[PDB]
Amino acid sequence: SGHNVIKMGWMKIGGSWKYSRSYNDARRGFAKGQWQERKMTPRFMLAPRVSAGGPRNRYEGKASFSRLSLSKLLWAVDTGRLNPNETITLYHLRNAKVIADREVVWPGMVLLAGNVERVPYPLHIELQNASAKAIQLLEEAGGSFTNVYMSHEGLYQELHPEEFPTFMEQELPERKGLENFATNSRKRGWLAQWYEDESRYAHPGAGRRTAHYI
């Protein structure tokens, strides 16, 4: 019930308008934007822009995972949301309401072990590209971890499994995701033991297979 006359404070309705010039400008949405500063050129006109895309241009395909703290997981298995008997995957987290569904965007998640030093019970997890110390922690506890990196429709066919009667065949990850995460022997990528087959895939014997192009 008052008028925030700038540089003068709240004023009564029916009060004095003699000193509300720049206020009648702000209400009209008219923005000068400090443009009387012709003399001093801002960083805007003198800032070389790298990366014709941008500093953090999230082009299609950029593998930007949504961070999942490891300490948020170990807090939900002793609270009682997660049953440590079973191979904890992305389906439970969404259904155990451990993490909201606004967090999960392709590619799914990432397990980060910061300010966590030990994990007492063995744990078996399927996430996309946990960090290094997050992996070593789980491996040191008897439990294990794998890197289930998958295409988009792999995420949907997994997070909503009660919408498919049978197993629609799931496409391999693309090349930039293959060599980085899935085929990575170090990151426990799931396609690593297959890429290291040698007998096939790591070197054919099938005629079509021989051309990686086919």
Binding site: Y121, T146, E162, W190
Partner: protein, 185 residues
């Protein structure tokens, strides 16, 4: 997909999870969701099988039909209900499969230790349990919303001296005069 504690089809790697130290987990959180997941399909059916019973003469031209166009029902069954059954079943299976592990745990203990030591081992009793279930027993804290009615602070309330009145019409009437009020500076 995963959705059951077996590992998804992504065990094409030799990542079969062995040496599972079989823990005793009582499915306390799961058994709620199933109780909810079961309550949905039980209603998702009720919505699916609503037939008109319009209590008004104007809308008595449809008084014995399903409220949902035949397509919209076979559509509601194959989409918005058959995913409410694969849900409870996914909940139900994830519990019947775990209770098979509570079997081995409670049956490897009944043969090594006393029923006195089990309800100390496989029981999640807590020092303040009565604060939520049987509140007549708890005294270590004042858990009441109306704390001023707890026994330990009931003295704070007044004890008025009331009395009925016959000529007032059964009106009850506190028999204490009102303290002289403050009126001026």
């Amino acid at each position: 997909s995963g959705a059951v504690g077996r590992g998804s089809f992504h065990s094409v790697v030799a990542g079969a999870n062995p040496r599972r130290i079989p823990t005793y987990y009582n499915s306390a959180y799961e058994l709620i969701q199933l109780h909810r997941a079961h309550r949905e399909v039980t209603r998702n059916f009720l919505v699916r099988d609503k037939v008109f019973d319009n209590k008004f003469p104007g809308c008595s031209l449809a008084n014995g039909l399903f409220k949902m166009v035949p397509n919209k029902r076979g559509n509601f069954h194959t989409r918005e209900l058959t995913e409410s059954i694969r849900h409870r079943t996914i909940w139900g299976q994830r519990i019947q499969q775990q209770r098979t592990i509570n079997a081995a745990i409670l049956e490897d203990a009944t043969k090594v230790l006393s029923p006195a030591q089990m309800e100390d081992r496989f029981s999640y009793r807590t020092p303040d349990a009565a604060a939520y279930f049987s509140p007549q027993e708890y005294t270590a804290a004042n858990n009441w919303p109306n704390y001023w009615q707890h026994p330990t602070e009931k003295h704070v309330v007044p004890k008025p001296r009331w009395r009925r009145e016959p000529e007032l019409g059964g009106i009850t009437r506190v028999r204490d005069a009102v303290a002289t009020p403050i009126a001026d500076y």
